[PDB]
Design a protein around this ligand. Structure first.
Ligand SMILES: Nc1nc2c(ncn2[C@@H]2O[C@H](COP(=O)(O)OP(=O)(O)OP(=O)(O)O)[C@@H](O)[C@H]2O)c(=O)[nH]1
Ligand SMILES: Nc1nc2c(ncn2[C@@H]2O[C@H](COP(=O)(O)OP(=O)(O)O)[C@@H](O)[C@H]2O)c(=O)[nH]1
Ligand SMILES: COc1ccc(CCc2nc3ccccc3s2)cc1O
Ligand SMILES: [Mg+2]
Lengths: 437, 431, 155
C-alpha cells in the first residue's frame, strides 16, 4: 500500500484518537473486534482503507496506530473500553508518571525514559508497511506530554525517517476548557521545536469547538466527549482522501503541495458545515450552495480568527455525500463573484475540489444529526496569525515577570530556550505579515 | 504519581494529623480497625494515595508519627482511630523539646531524626510511584518546628525529585503558651521558604478569630480550632483522594499555583464555617458558597485578601450543585473584583468540583489562594520576633544549644526579604 | 564579686541566694555588661518575689540598660502582669522610652498582652506616643489587624 501511521500523545491526543478510530471503523464497516464482512480479502489486502488498517491472517483489521501517555489513566480506558480488542496491545504505551503540565518534563526528564520504547514500537508498525508515507500526530499544545513528548518524538522521527511526511492535529488551548496556567508556555515551546519537523499542522481551537457545541448542538456545558466527537468528524473529513479512492489529497505529500506553499506557514484553517443537532433529525436538507457559503462564516471555523482580515494562499473543498459536481462549480463561482475573499498575487486563485459520494457517518452516541451532504474547507490564510498573536501575548505577560519559569529550568531546560522559542514565534508572525498586507 | 507519605511531628502536628486521618477515613469508609465499610466504589479508586492495603481487605494509613516527648503517643493511640496506625511507625523520644526550636533542630531532634528517616525510607520503598511528602506541624513549638524543618531538609536531600508539602500552623498570642513562639516560627519560616514546594498557612490567630467572633464561642478550645483545621485539610486534599477529571496531584498543584519558588505559602479558606455539632448551616446556595469562600472572614490565615492581589487561586466545590451556576458565580467574582487578581497571569483562577461532600454537609467549598496579602502574616511574626530579639530575651536558651546568634539575624533577614518579594509583585503592572 | 552572683541569682529565680547575697552587701543595683540590673532580670524571667524583695531594698525601679530598657519595658514585653503592677506601684515610669522609641504600651500591644495593655492605660500610658517609625500602639493594632487590641485602646 502507501500506509499511514497515526500517533496519539497525551490525554487530548489519546482521547481524540479514540473518537477518530471509532468513526473510522464505522465508515469502513469494521466491528470493534476488527472483523469486516463487507469486503472479503483473506489477508493483507491492498484496498484504500489498508492505508490505515493492516490485516491479520484471521481477517482482523488492526489500526496502524500508536497511543502514548506518560501516565496510564487515559490509556487504561482504551484497554478496557469498547475497542479494547481493536488495537495492537503493544501499541498502547504508558509510563507511571506524567509531565505535570510541564513541557520540560515531557521533553526531557520524564519523556527520556520512554522515548526509545515508543520508537521501537513505531518501528514494528513501519516494518509491516510496503510503502510508508509518514505519520499523523495528535496532541495538545497545552499539556506537558502533548507539548514536550511530542516535540521530542517529532525530533527523533525526523532523524529516523528523513523522507517521510509528518502531519499534526494539534489542540490549541482555550480558557473555557483548560487545565493549566502554563499552557501558553508549553504551546510556544512545542511550536518552536516542532516547526521544522512538521510539514502540515491542523490546529483545533478548543474555544471554537466549544462555541459550536453550545450554539449549534445546544449543549450548555460541553464535555470532552462532546468536543472530541465533533473534532473527529472534522479529522475524518480531512483524512478520508487517504482512506478512500479520490482525486484530491490522495497522499500525505499532496497535502503540502496543495495547502503549504512555504514550509514555515504550514497551518491551514479548517471550516466544517453543516453542524446540526441530533434532536433536529427531520431538518430540511441544505444545498451545496448553502453548505459552501457556510464555509466562509467564521462561526464554523476550527480556529477563531477573521479570514476577511487576511489573504488566502490555498483553498481546498472536501465534499461528502449527495454532491453533484456542477452544483459545486456554480457555488464556487458565486463565492468568487459576491464574496471579497482575496488571494495573494503569487498563487493560483482557484479552488481545489474533492468529492466523496458516501454520506457522512455519525457515531451512535453522538450529538450530530445525519446529513445528506457536508463539506470541509481547508484554507491557508494569513488570518490564522491572529491565533498565534493571542498565544504570544499570554506568553509575554507571564514571561515578562519570569512567572513559572523555575519549574522548567528545574527539569533539564535552559532559560535561554524561552526567548529562542518566543523570537521564533515573532519571526513566524512577521512571515504572515510579509505574505499578506 | 499516586502515593503520599504523611508525617506528623510534635504535639500540634500529631493532634491535627490524627484529626485528618479520622476525617478522611470516614469519607473513604474505613473504620478504626482498618476495614472498609463504604457504600460507594469511588471511596476505593484512589485510596492508595494515603493508605497501604493490608493482609485481608484492611487499610493502614501511610503515616509516620513523630515527637520528642512520649505523652503524645498515648493520646493518639487513645484516640478514636489510634489503633489504625502502624505501631512501628510511632517514632518518639524520651525528653521533649521544651518549646525550643534549637533542641528540636540541633540536639534532641538530631538524635532521633535518623530513626525517623529509617521509617520514611521503608514507607517510600513500598510505593509504586511516590509523589511526595506531607507534613503537619506547628511553627511555634520546638519539635514540630525545629525537628520538623530538620526532617524536611533531610528528606529533601534524599528525595529531591519528590514534592514536599506542609500544613504549618502559625502561632498567635491569642492561643499562646510562651513569647518565644515568634523565635521558633521565624527560624522555621527560614527553612520552609527554601525546602518546601507548597505550604498551607494555618494561622491560629485566624482560627481563634473565627471561633470567637464568627462562631461566638466565648472560650475556644484546641478542639474548636482543630475542627476548622480538619475541615480545611479535608477540602484541600479532596482532589488528591477522589477521581474527578482534574487528575490532581501535588506537582500539578505546585506548577500551577507557585509562579515564584519562594512564594509558595497558601492562604486556605472554607465555607460554610460551622462549629462542632451545630447543624445550623442548611440553606446554603452556590452564590453564597462563592461569596463566603472569598470573604476575609473565611480565611484560615489572618490576612485581608483585599489588601493584596491574588497571583493564583484554586476553588474546590463539593456536593451536588449546578456546574452552570458555579461557573457564572466564579466569573462574577473575578469581574467585579478584577483589581485583586494580577493581570499578568492569564486564567489564574481554577475551578474544581467533587461529587462527594464532607460529613454533615451537602454543599461546601474550599479555597486555596496564593495572595500577596499573606505578607501581613509574616509582618506580624516579624514585628514580634524583632520586639523580642532587640531585647535579647531568652536568647541563651538557643545559644546554649550551640546555636549562633547570627542565625537569628539571618532568619529575620530572610523573612523580611520574603515580605518585600510579595510587595514587589503586589505593585507590579502588566504594561 | 557579689554583684555578678546577684545578677545570676535574680535571673535564675534563686530567692534564698538573693536574700543571703544582699545580707553580705551585694550591690542591689549592680549592672552586667549591657546595663541590666537584678531587677531587670527578675522582671524579665517572671520572679515576682525577687522583684518585690529588690524593690524593698533600694532597687532603682526606673533604671535603664544601654538600650534604654527599663524593668517595666521587659515585664510588659514578656507578659508578667503581676510584676507590671508591682513595678507601677513602686513608681515605674509608665511612659519610659527606649532607644527604639518604644514605650511599655508599644511592647505589650506588639506581643498581644491585652490585660497588661489595659493596666498600662489605666496608669496613664501615652496613647499618642510614637516609636521611631512614627507608630503609636493604636497604629500597631490597626496595621496588624488586632481588633481586640484596637477596641481596648479606644477608651
Ligand atoms: N479537545 C480536547 N481537548 C483536551 C482533551 N483532553 C485535554 N484537552 C486539552 O488539552 C490541554 C491539556 O493537555 P493534556 O493532553 O490533557 O495533558 P497531557 O498531554 O496528558 O500532558 P500532562 O497531563 O501534563 O502530562 C488543555 O488545553 C485541555 O483543555 C480532550 O479529550 N479533547
Ligand atoms: N491549632 C492548634 N494549635 C496547637 C495545638 N497544639 C499546639 N498548638 C500550637 O502549637 C504551638 C506549640 O507547639 P507544640 O506543637 O505544642 O510544641 P511541640 O510539641 O514541641 O511541637 C503553639 O502555637 C500552640 O498554640 C492544637 O491542637 N491545635
Ligand atoms: C490556578 O490555576 C490552576 C491551579 C491548579 C491546577 C491543577 C492542579 C490542582 N491540584 C490540586 C490539588 C488539590 C486541590 C486543588 C488542586 S488544583 C490547574 C490550574 O490551572
Ligand atoms: Mg495527562
Amino acid at each position: 500500500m502507501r500506509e499511514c501511521i497515526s500517533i496519539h500523545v497525551g490525554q487530548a491526543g489519546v482521547q481524540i484518537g479514540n473518537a477518530c478510530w471509532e468513526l473510522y471503523c464505522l465508515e469502513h464497516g469494521i466491528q470493534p473486534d476488527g472483523q469486516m464482512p463487507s469486503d472479503k480479502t483473506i489477508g493483507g489486502g491492498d484496498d484504500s482503507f489498508n492505508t490505515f488498517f493492516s490485516e491479520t491472517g484471521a481477517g482482523k483489521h488492526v489500526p496502524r496506530a500508536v497511543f502514548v501517555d506518560l501516565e496510564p489513566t487515559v490509556i487504561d480506558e482504551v484497554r478496557t473500553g469498547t475497542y479494547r480488542q481493536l488495537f495492537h496491545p503493544e501499541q498502547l504505551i504508558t509510563g507511571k508518571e506524567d509531565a505535570a503540565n510541564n513541557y520540560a518534563r515531557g521533553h526531557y526528564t520524564i519523556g527520556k525514559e520512554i522515548i526509545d520504547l515508543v520508537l521501537d514500537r513505531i518501528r514494528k508498525l513501519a516494518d509491516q508497511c510496503t510503502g510508508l508515507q509518514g505519520f499523523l500526530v495528535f496532541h495538545s499544545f497545552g499539556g506537558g506530554t502533548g507539548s514536550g513528548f511530542t516535540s521530542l518524538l517529532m525530533e527523533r522521527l525526523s532523524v529516523d525517517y528523513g523522507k517521510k511526511s509528518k502531519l499534526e492535529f494539534s489542540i490549541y488551548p482555550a480558557p473555557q476548557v483548560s487545565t493549566a496556567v502554563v499552557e501558553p508556555y508549553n504551546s510556544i515551546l512545542t511550536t518552536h521545536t516542532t516547526l521544522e519537523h512538521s510539514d502540515c499542522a491542523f490546529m483545533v481551537d478548543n474555544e471554537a469547538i466549544y462555541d459550536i457545541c453550545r450554539r449549534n448542538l445546544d449543549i450548555e456545558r460541553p464535555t470532552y466527549t462532546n468536543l472530541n466527537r465533533l473534532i473527529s468528524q472534522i479529522v475524518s473529513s480531512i483524512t478520508a482522501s487517504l482512506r478512500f479512492d479520490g482525486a484530491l489529497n490522495v497522499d500525505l505529500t499532496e497535502f503540502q503541495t496543495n495547502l503549504v506553499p512555504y514550509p514555515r506557514i504550514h497551518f491551514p484553517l479548517a471550516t466544517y458545515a453543516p453542524v446540526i443537532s441530533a434532536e433536529k433529525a427531520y431538518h430540511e436538507q441544505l444545498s451545496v450552495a448553502e453548505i459552501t457559503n457556510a464555509c466562509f462564516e467564521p462561526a464554523n471555523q476550527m480556529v477563531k480568527c477573521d479570514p476577511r482580515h487576511g489573504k488566502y494562499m490555498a483553498c481546498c473543498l472536501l465534499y461528502r455525500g449527495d454532491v453533484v459536481p456542477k452544483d459545486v462549480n456554480a457555488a464556487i463561482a458565486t463565492i468568487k463573484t459576491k464574496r471579497s475573499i482575496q488571494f495573494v498575487d503569487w498563487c493560483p486563485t482557484g479552488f481545489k475540489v474533492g468529492i466523496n459520494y458516501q454520506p457522512p457517518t455519525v457515531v451512535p452516541g453522538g450529538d450530530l444529526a445525519k446529513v445528506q451532504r457536508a463539506v470541509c474547507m481547508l484554507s491557508n490564510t494569513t488570518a490564522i496569525a491572529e491565533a498565534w498573536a493571542r498565544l504570544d501575548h499570554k506568553f509575554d505577560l507571564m514571561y515578562a515577570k519570569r512567572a513559572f519559569v523555575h519549574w522548567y529550568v528545574g527539569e533539564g531546560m535552559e532559560e535561554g530556550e524561552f526567548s529562542e522559542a518566543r523570537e521564533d514565534m515573532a519571526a513566524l508572525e512577521k512571515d504572515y505579515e510579509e505574505v499578506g498586507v | 504519581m499516586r502515593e503520599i507519605v504523611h508525617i506528623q511531628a510534635g504535639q500540634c502536628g500529631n493532634q491535627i494529623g490524627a484529626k485528618f486521618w479520622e476525617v478522611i477515613s470516614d469519607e473513604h469508609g474505613i473504620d478504626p480497625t482498618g476495614s472498609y465499610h463504604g457504600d460507594s466504589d469511588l471511596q476505593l479508586e484512589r485510596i492508595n494515595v494515603y493508605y497501604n492495603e493490608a493482609t485481608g481487605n484492611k487499610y493502614v494509613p501511610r503515616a509516620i508519627l513523630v515527637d520528642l516527648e512520649p505523652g503524645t503517643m498515648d493520646s493518639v493511640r487513645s484516640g478514636p482511630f489510634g489503633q489504625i496506625f502502624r505501631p512501628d511507625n510511632f517514632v518518639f523520644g524520651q525528653s521533649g523539646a521544651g518549646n525550643n526550636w534549637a533542641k528540636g533542630h540541633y540536639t534532641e531532634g538530631a538524635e532521633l531524626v535518623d530513626s525517623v528517616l529509617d521509617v520514611v525510607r521503608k514507607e517510600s520503598e513500598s510505593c509504586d510511584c511516590l509523589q511526595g511528602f506531607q507534613l503537619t506541624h506547628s511553627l511555634g513549638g520546638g519539635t514540630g518546628s525545629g525537628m520538623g524543618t530538620l526532617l524536611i531538609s533531610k528528606i529533601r536531600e534524599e528525595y529531591p525529585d519528590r514534592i514536599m508539602n506542609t500544613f504549618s500552623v502559625m502561632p498567635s498570642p491569642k492561643v499562646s503558651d510562651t513569647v518565644v513562639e515568634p523565635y521558633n516560627a521565624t527560624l522555621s519560616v527560614h527553612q520552609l521558604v527554601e525546602n518546601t514546594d507548597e505550604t498551607y498557612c494555618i494561622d491560629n490567630e485566624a482560627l481563634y478569630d473565627i471561633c470567637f467572633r464568627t462562631l461566638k464561642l466565648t472560650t475556644p478550645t484546641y478542639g474548636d480550632l482543630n475542627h476548622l483545621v480538619s475541615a480545611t485539610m479535608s477540602g484541600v486534599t479532596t482532589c488528591l483522594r477522589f477521581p474527578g477529571q482534574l487528575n490532581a496531584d501535588l506537582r500539578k498543584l505546585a506548577v500551577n499555583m507557585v509562579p515564584f519558588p519562594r512564594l509558595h505559602f497558601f492562604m486556605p479558606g472554607f465555607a460554610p464555617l460551622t462549629s462542632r455539632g451545630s447543624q445550623q448551616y442548611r440553606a446554603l446556595t452556590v452564590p453564597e458558597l462563592t461569596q463566603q469562600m472569598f470573604d476575609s472572614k473565611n480565611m484560615m490565615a489572618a490576612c485581608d485578601p483585599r489588601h493584596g492581589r491574588y497571583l493564583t487561586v484554586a476553588a474546590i466545590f463539593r456536593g451536588r450543585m449546578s456546574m452552570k451556576e458555579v461557573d457564572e458565580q466564579m466569573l462574577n467574582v473575578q469581574n467585579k473584583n478584577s483589581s485583586y487578581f494580577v493581570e499578568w497571569i492569564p486564567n489564574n483562577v481554577k475551578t474544581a468540583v467533587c461529587d462527594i461532600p464532607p460529613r454533615g454537609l451537602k454543599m461546601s467549598a474550599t479555597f486555596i489562594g496564593n495572595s500577596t496579602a499573606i505578607q501581613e502574616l509574616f509582618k506580624r511574626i516579624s514585628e514580634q520576633f524583632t520586639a523580642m530579639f532587640r531585647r535579647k530575651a531568652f536568647l541563651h536558651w538557643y545559644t546554649g544549644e550551640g546555636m549562633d546568634e547570627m542565625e537569628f539575624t539571618e532568619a529575620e533577614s530572610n523573612m523580611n526579604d520574603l515580605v518585600s518579594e510579595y510587595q514587589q509583585y503586589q505593585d507590579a503592572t502588566a504594561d | 564579686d557579689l554583684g555578678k552572683k546577684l545578677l545570676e541569682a535574680a535571673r535564675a529565680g534563686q530567692d534564698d541566694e538573693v536574700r543571703i547575697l544582699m545580707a553580705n552587701g551585694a550591690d542591689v543595683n549592680a549592672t552586667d555588661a549591657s546595663g541590666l540590673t537584678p531587677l531587670h532580670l527578675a522582671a524579665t524571667y517572671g520572679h515576682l518575689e525577687i522583684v518585690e524583695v529588690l524593690l524593698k531594698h533600694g532597687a532603682d525601679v526606673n533604671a535603664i540598660d544601654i538600650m534604654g530598657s527599663t524593668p517595666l519595658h521587659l515585664a510588659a514585653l514578656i507578659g508578667h502582669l503581676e510584676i507590671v503592677e508591682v513595678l507601677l506601684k513602686h513608681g515605674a515610669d509608665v511612659n519610659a522610652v527606649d532607644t527604639w522609641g518604644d514605650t511599655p504600651l508599644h511592647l505589650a500591644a506588639i506581643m498581644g498582652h491585652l490585660e497588661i495593655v489595659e493596666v498600662l492605660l489605666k496608669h496613664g500610658a501615652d496613647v499618642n506616643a510614637q516609636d521611631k517609625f512614627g507608630k503609636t500602639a493604636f497604629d500597631i493594632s490597626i496595621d496588624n489587624g488586632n481588633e481586640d487590641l484596637a477596641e481596648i485602646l479606644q477608651k
